[PDB]
Structures are given as C-alpha cells and as structure tokens.
Amino acid sequence: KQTLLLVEDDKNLADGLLVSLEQAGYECLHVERIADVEPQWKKADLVILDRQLPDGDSVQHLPEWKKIKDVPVILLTALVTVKDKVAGLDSGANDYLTKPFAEAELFARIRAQLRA
Numbered sequence: 563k564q565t566l567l568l569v570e571d572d573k574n575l576a577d578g579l580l581v582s583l584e585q586a587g588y589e590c591l592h593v594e595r596i597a598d599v600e601p602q603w604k605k606a607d608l609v610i611l612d613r614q615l616p617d618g619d620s621v622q623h624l625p626e627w628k629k630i631k632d633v634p635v636i637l638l639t640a641l642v643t644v645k646d647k648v649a650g651l652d653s654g655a656n657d658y659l660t661k662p663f664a665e666a667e668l669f670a671r672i673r674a675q676l677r678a
C-alpha cells in the first residue's frame with residue numbers, strides 16, 4: 563500500500579478527489595493549510611500540492627519541505643502561466659499539472675512518479 567498527501571484548500575475538489583485514489587488502492591492524507599504540511603511531510607510517499615493556500619504560496623516552503631525527505635511532488639494549482647510552471651518545477655517539483663485537469667492523467671503522472 564502506498565501513501566499520498568493531498569495539500570488542497572479547495573474542500574469539494576479534495577472531496578471527490580480523495581475517493582478515486584482510495585479506489586486506486588491508496589491511503590491518503592488531506593491538508594488545507596501550510597501550517598499542516600510539515601507534520602505530515604514525513605508520512606506520504608508523494609505530495610499532490612496546491613499552490614495558493616489561505617496561508618500563502620506553498621512553493622516557497624517546497625525546497626525546505628523537500629530536504630526533510632526526497633518526496634515526489636506534483637503541483638496541482640490554478641496557476642497556468644509558463645512563469646508559474648518554471649517556478650514550481652525548479653523549486654524541487656518532480657512534475658507540474660495545471661487546473662482544469664484529467665483524473666486519468668493525474669493518476670498516470672502519479673503512476674509514473676512511483677516506479678523508480
């Protein structure tokens with residue numbers, strides 16, 4: 563069994579999301595602030611990361627998050643500009659996928675981050 567962590571302030575988006583991954587045979591964590599990622603970063607084998615929480619930007623903490631544990635990070639945010647893409651990808655994100663998004667593709671990019 564594999565463990566992912568969902569960092570998302572959008573509840574209802576996280577609502578229908580946290581069920582498909584469970585149907586994919588996972589155990590997940592949900593987080594809606596930046597004051598809740600550090601307690602759970604050491605727990606998941608992959609982080610699905612939303613940028614603008616009510617705390618601020620989550621990419622600013624991403625490097626200091628990444629060196630606690632080299633965890634694959636997938637940035638799922640409504641920041642679609644290429645300037646935002648190069649920001650997260652270089653900050654330590656193994657992938658970057660914008661909103662709106664495909665569940666079958668997000669799962670494929672998760673199935674691609676966990677084969678090593």
Ligand code: BEF
Pocket residue numbers: 571612613614615638639640641661
């Ligand atoms: F509000 Be998130 F970054 F999509």
Ligand SMILES: [Mg+2]
Pocket residue numbers: 570571572612613614615
């Ligand atoms: Mg958000």
